[PDB]
Design a binder for this molecule. Structure first.
Ligand SMILES: [K+]
Ligand SMILES: [K+]
Ligand SMILES: [K+]
Ligand SMILES: [K+]
Ligand SMILES: [K+]
Ligand SMILES: [K+]
Ligand SMILES: [K+]
Ligand SMILES: [K+]
Ligand SMILES: [K+]
Ligand SMILES: [K+]
Ligand SMILES: [K+]
Ligand SMILES: [K+]
Ligand SMILES: [Mg+2]
Ligand SMILES: [Mg+2]
Ligand SMILES: [Mg+2]
Ligand SMILES: [Mg+2]
Ligand SMILES: [Mg+2]
Ligand SMILES: [Mg+2]
Ligand SMILES: [Mg+2]
Ligand SMILES: [Mg+2]
Ligand SMILES: [Mg+2]
Ligand SMILES: [Mg+2]
Ligand SMILES: [Mg+2]
Ligand SMILES: [Mg+2]
Lengths: 150, 206, 84, 212, 100
RNA sequence: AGGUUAAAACUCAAAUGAAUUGACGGGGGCCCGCACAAGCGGUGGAGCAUGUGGUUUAAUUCGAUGCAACGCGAAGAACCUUACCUGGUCUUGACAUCCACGGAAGUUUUCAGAGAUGAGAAUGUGCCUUCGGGAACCGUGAGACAGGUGCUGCAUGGCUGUCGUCAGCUCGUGUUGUGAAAUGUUGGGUUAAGUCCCGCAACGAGCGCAACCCUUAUCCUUUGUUGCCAGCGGUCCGGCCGGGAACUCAAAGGAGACUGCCAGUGAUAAACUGGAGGAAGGUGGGGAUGACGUCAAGUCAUCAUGGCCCUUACGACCAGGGCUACACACGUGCUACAAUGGCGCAUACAAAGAGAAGCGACCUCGCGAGAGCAAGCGGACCUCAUAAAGUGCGUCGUAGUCCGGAUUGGAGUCUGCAACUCGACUCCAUGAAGUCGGAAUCGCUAGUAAUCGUGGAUCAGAAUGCCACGGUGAAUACGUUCCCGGGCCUU
């Protein structure tokens, strides 16, 4: 806001893996305040990812996030009769936030039967940079590259 | 915009209830109806008595009515003849044994209801509204009111277009809950129409 | 609908009227405001004029009509179509 | 909107229609008939000023020589709809008009009568007067009470200019301090309603008022 | 309300009190399973004969001061407008503006 | 090209200059708000609920109409309500006062009538009582009057919406100006705040702001049943019992938060920033509280009221109908379109509230809605009363489905004189649209949104509405370039 008096809110770490990063992801995946349902999906998806990855769930999650995370984004600015997309660096916390949101969106759009399956498949695809979520990151970077002049 | 009733907001803080009896839902409505009828009768009968407030209490099965009047004697009558008449009628209306107590109101200029009743009487007598308002304000300030406000609304002076005029002297802090503000209203019935008077009197905080 | 324990409902005036008509013979249509009264087997073969609010509509009671209220066979509202 | 016509005008319309029709009954020459047809058609049109399709239909029926009395009645009923009824004053207003006569009483006047009433007049036996209320050229309600003769004779009525049972009506001037007063009056129909129906010209009534 | 409307209510209350005992009995006869069908049938017809205003359902709660048919509160026996006026004057005991 | 000289008729009651207070600007500056940005969930599409417009109708009663009408008056239209229509009726009268006259009042019944009501019958015949009587209440007859949800909210009172819980709006005295006016109230900092400090032809004051008030977060004291059970004793394992007053909780009285303390910055200021302690920190959270005024804003249908109008009718009574109509348009909701789900089974954890023409257990009976019987409870006791989401397990497998639940047929239950028009609910069967919604548009910054249930008022019955209560419980705010609105100063 104009006052800019906003402060950070504490987030409890996820019980199983003791990660605040994963707790954020659960909250993004959560719908209608049903955290338990969200937590079950995330834990199920991570396990499946871990088996295929052959890595720890947290490690595997981090690899997927790294690919999806966006370095730069474009903010629209109206100049005269036209609007200019202006490349702006993404803050580290926002980088994580955008990545997680995109993965959840990507998982939901997938046609796999269960959300846990959808999430796991998306996370795996994100690790190998074949996911739709990674495509968004590529698109966001591409747009920023085009508007580098501004 | 609109403003909260000054007495209503302060009720239970610095202002007492006029009726102070306990009843269950069964009898609550019946008591209210009886209280209304008693107050209605007494006001009509004691219109010239300068009654300010009627406090109706219901101890046990009996009803105790306390009448606050600027002129105590005329309500009492001669050898308590008038008060006894009132008691008998009140008991009939109440349907229970009745007790009538008469309390004198000192400083009638400092009582909002008595001031409002005075002004409305004058307006019906066709006294100029401004003069009545100003005198009331002056009278209260002399008697030692910390502040007073008088508002008169309607077709003042028989004007086709109705207007509101208000005169305030001293402090009248309506927002302050601890502040003791005496508020009352009176309607003046004239050939032109109804003229409404509102009187606020500040008697100090707490 | 009405409880079976309570039984069928008919207005007493109508019941008396029907009985009088049955005993007498063929009669001029009975005029009733009792739309709520249930049609009974005894009424069959009798024309009963039921009020629709503005006029009495003649209804010849039949076997199929039995077990229905008289009001069902008289229409209260008149609709000839919108923008017809 | 439907044309609005005065009650006296409607009476004229009725008279001309009856006159127009009687020509068809009597006159054997089509030529003479035709001349009157045109005259009457114009007269009806003149009163209406503007003729709607309903008036035109009636006029067409009127123009036909095969017009019948039953048809005439229907045509008149339509024309009656165009007529505007006399406005009764408020009972308070009436008493204000008749300030001199306290607690003046008015009989119930038929709506049709009001519709065909150029003026409204009622007779009280106790009064032995006829109370007349009417709207003048200014359209101010004018109320007047004058003595009505108990005797009735057959003669031409001043108001309607028609021979009928008439009773002399006298209007008294305001009494002076001396007690001298002047009464001026002329024979008029005892029944105001009958006279109203007979009257075809508002001016004739006005002239009678002028005489008073 | 109109004076007639208030009068109508008074009649309905009076008739309800008059036939209260009769109505209760008749309804009980219809309710009873053990009671004969003829007895029930006669009772049904009798209940119809009794005045309609006798039924408590016909009575509508009105503000005692104004006779207003809407916004009634059973506790005070008054409509919202009159309840508010009385509350501000302190005529209703124990009633104050509530904030929580 | 035109220049120069230069009229009149006719027409208007002004045209005009300067300055003033506002308002306004696609003028400037400075702040601020779910204003944008950043997010989350919606609305607009479907079906249905509900209101409105329109159309229709005998009537579909009246009112509300940008925000600030449209689940609004109405916290609940089968009859009643009801104000509307149709028909049947009454005229000092449904409701008052007064007077005369006759009857206690009433109570029980008969016939006709849709009823209103009318014609009857029978039974009471009291109460006071100067055995003069009253007045109890029925009549009957006048006539003063009654009556009107009839009209004007642009004659009004009262009450309410709104800008806006925005920080403004003013007065006295002094001073300045011929004056309208100005000053104070501007200026420098600062605040959520005309908040505060400083300066200052102003000095003061009032209404606003804030505080005082309610509630929530912590603790202490008193009290200890209907509430509680730590330590004991005993058990029917249930605070169940004898007990204990520890604890929770109940509800009265207190304590606590003050920028108080500390550091830095700031004009040796107000203040701001950080920090410590603390349950709580700088307005701790929520609420009540709404300045002078604006909109001839809403309400003559709550009520009151000036004027006007009707008065055998614009009053009053009754039955039936209507307010529920349905080519259509719109507002607000509910339920969906599934798998973060549906269904089956098993199994946890609330708050708040209501109740005697009431809440009604248990038990029995019914597939069920319910029924019968019958405790207890005017309630920390009894009853409503089951929390649901959740969790475990199983199943369904992406289908118009084991999604959805409209519609309709049949059969019932209950309330009520009475559910045809036109109730709710249950059972069996039926199984529509809908697969995420064009242009456009709304809410929300935290215990919030979203989602999940629970209660209450109104109320015979009749909630998807309204009001209230807990459960679970987010995302995001870089920021002020932009859009919109608001405040202050300047032009
Ligand atoms: K000139
Ligand atoms: K939608
Ligand atoms: K007003
Ligand atoms: K001054
Ligand atoms: K100057
Ligand atoms: K009026
Ligand atoms: K319907
Ligand atoms: K709804
Ligand atoms: K909708
Ligand atoms: K129904
Ligand atoms: K109910
Ligand atoms: K400006
Ligand atoms: Mg009811
Ligand atoms: Mg020249
Ligand atoms: Mg829709
Ligand atoms: Mg209006
Ligand atoms: Mg109705
Ligand atoms: Mg207005
Ligand atoms: Mg201040
Ligand atoms: Mg305040
Ligand atoms: Mg207006
Ligand atoms: Mg009716
Ligand atoms: Mg409606
Ligand atoms: Mg400011």
């Amino acid at each position: 806001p104009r006052r800019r008096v906003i402060g950070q809110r504490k987030i409890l770490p996820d019980p199983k893996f003791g990660s605040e990063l994963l707790a954020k992801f659960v909250n993004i995946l959560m719908v209608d305040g049903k955290k338990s349902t969200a937590e079950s999906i995330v834990y199920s998806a991570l396990e499946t990812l871990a088996q295929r990855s052959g890595k720890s769930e947290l490690e595997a999650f981090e690899v997927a996030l790294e690919n999806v995370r966006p370095t730069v984004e474009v903010k629209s600015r109206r100049v005269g009769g036209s609007t200019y997309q202006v490349p702006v660096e993404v803050r580290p916390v926002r980088r994580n936030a955008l990545a997680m949101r995109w993965i959840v969106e990507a998982a939901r759009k997938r046609g796999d039967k269960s959300m846990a399956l959808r999430l796991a498949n998306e996370l795996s695809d994100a690790a190998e940079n074949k996911g739709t979520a990674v495509k968004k990151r590529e698109d966001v970077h591409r747009m920023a590259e085009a508007n580098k002049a501004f | 915009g609109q403003k909260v009733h000054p007495n209503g907001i302060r009720l239970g803080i610095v202002k007492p209830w006029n009726s102070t009896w306990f009843a269950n839902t069964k009898e609550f409505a019946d008591n209210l109806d009886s209280d209304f009828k008693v107050r209605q009768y007494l006001t009509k009968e004691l219109a010239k008595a300068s009654v300010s407030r009627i406090v109706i209490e219901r101890p046990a099965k009996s009803i105790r009515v306390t009448i606050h009047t600027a002129r105590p004697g005329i309500v009492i009558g001669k050898k308590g003849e008038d008060v006894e008449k009132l008691r008998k009628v009140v008991a009939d209306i109440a349907g229970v044994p009745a007790q009538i107590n008469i309390a004198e109101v000192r400083k009638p200029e400092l009582d909002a209801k008595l001031v409002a009743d005075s002004i409305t009487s004058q307006l019906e007598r066709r006294v100029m509204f401004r003069r009545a308002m100003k005198r009331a304000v002056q009278n209260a300030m002399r008697l030692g009111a910390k502040g007073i406000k008088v508002e008169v609304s309607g077709r003042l002076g028989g004007a086709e277009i109705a207007r509101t005029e208000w005169y305030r002297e001293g402090r009248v802090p309506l927002h302050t809950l601890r502040a003791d503000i005496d508020y009352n209203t009176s309607e003046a019935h004239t050939t032109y129409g109804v003229i409404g008077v509102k009187v606020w009197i500040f008697k100090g905080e707490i | 609908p009405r409880s079976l324990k309570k039984g069928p409902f008919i207005d007493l005036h109508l019941l008396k009227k029907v009985e009088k008509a049955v005993e007498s013979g063929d009669k001029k249509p009975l005029r009733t405001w009792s739309r709520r009264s249930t049609i009974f087997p005894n009424m069959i073969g009798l024309t009963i004029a039921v009020h629709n609010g503005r006029q009495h509509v003649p209804v010849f009671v039949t076997d199929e009509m039995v077990g229905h209220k008289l009001g069902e066979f008289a229409p209260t509202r008149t609709y000839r179509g919108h923008a017809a | 909107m439907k044309t609005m016509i005065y009650p006296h005008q409607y009476n004229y319309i009725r008279s001309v229609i009856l006159r127009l029709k009687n020509v068809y009954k009597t006159v054997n020459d089509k030529e003479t008939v035709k001349v009157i047809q045109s005259e009457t058609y114009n007269d009806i049109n003149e009163i209406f000023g503007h003729i709607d399709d309903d008036i035109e239909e009636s006029l067409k029926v009127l123009m036909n020589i095969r017009l019948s009395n039953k048809e005439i009645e229907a045509i008149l009923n339509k024309f009656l709809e165009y007529v505007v009824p006399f406005e009764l004053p408020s009972p308070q207003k009436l008493q204000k008009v008749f300030k001199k006569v306290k607690k003046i009483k008015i009989p119930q006047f038929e709506e049709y009568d009001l519709k065909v009433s150029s003026f409204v007049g009622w007779n009280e036996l106790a009064s032995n007067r006829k109370y007349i209320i009417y709207y003048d050229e200014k359209k101010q309600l004018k109320g007047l009470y004058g003595e009505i003769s108990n005797q009735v004779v057959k003669g031409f009525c001043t108001i309607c200019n028609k021979e009928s049972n008439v009773s002399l009506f006298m209007k008294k001037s305001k009494t002076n301090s001396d007690g001298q007063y002047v009464k001026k009056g002329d024979y008029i129909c005892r029944d105001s309603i009958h006279c109203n129906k007979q009257l075809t010209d508002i001016n004739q009534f006005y002239n009678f008022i002028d005489k008073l | 309300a109109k004076q007639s409307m208030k009068a109508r209510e008074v009649k309905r209350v009076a008739l309800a009190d008059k036939y209260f005992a009769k109505r209760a009995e008749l309804k009980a006869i219809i309710s009873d399973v053990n009671a004969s069908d003829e007895d029930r049938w006669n009772a049904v017809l009798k209940l119809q004969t009794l005045p309609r205003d006798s039924s408590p359902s016909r009575q509508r709660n009105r503000c005692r001061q104004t006779g207003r048919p809407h916004g009634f509160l059973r506790k005070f026996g008054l409509s919202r407008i009159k309840v508010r006026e009385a509350a501000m004057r302190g005529e209703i005991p124990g009633l104050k503006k509530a904030s929580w």
